[PDB]
Ligand binder design. Sequence first.
Ligand SMILES: CC[C@H](CO)NC(=O)Nc1ccc(Cl)cc1
Length: 186
Amino acid sequence: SMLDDAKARLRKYDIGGKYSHLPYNKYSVLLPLVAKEGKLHLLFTVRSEKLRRAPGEVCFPGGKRDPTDMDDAATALREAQEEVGLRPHQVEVVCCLVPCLIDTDTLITPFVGLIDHNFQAQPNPAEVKDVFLVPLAYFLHPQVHDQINHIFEYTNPEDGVTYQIKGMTANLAVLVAFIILEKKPT
Ligand SMILES: CC[C@H](CO)NC(=O)Nc1ccc(Cl)cc1
């Protein structure tokens, strides 16, 4: 099936806990995969204008590890629950992708999760201004604008709203699209 095939592909790129004990300032993100209308989609947030870091930017749900978290995957799930109301029974964490080094002292660990079909996002306005889906296939033929650094523009056909996706968030979206969609019969 579509979903069994995606999980099987993702498992080949899992690094597991190989870099998880290194002494960094630690953050995790969840890359949430949603199946709709027979295609895979990624779920994105727009950060609240009130936040200190990156207000109003497009990002994946996530945040800083705390002492309650059993492991780095727990960080991602706790933060996703706080931001968009995703509960544990509604997500299956399939793998841990290559981590992102930033600021000389920080390590960001990305997890891919398969989202239940009955989940409906409940944006927490203290943290998130908006939540939206983008089909995974978009990232193979994106609409690129140069700011020089490359920026993607995605327009939702439901309402005409355009979102700018860039940086680590854009890079990770392309990586997931390549892993899941490369070399597939039609
Ligand atoms: C390279 C400098 C930039 C801006 O100052 N650092 C930065 O954006 N840090 C960061 C990003 C994501 C997360 Cl999750 C945690 C920290």
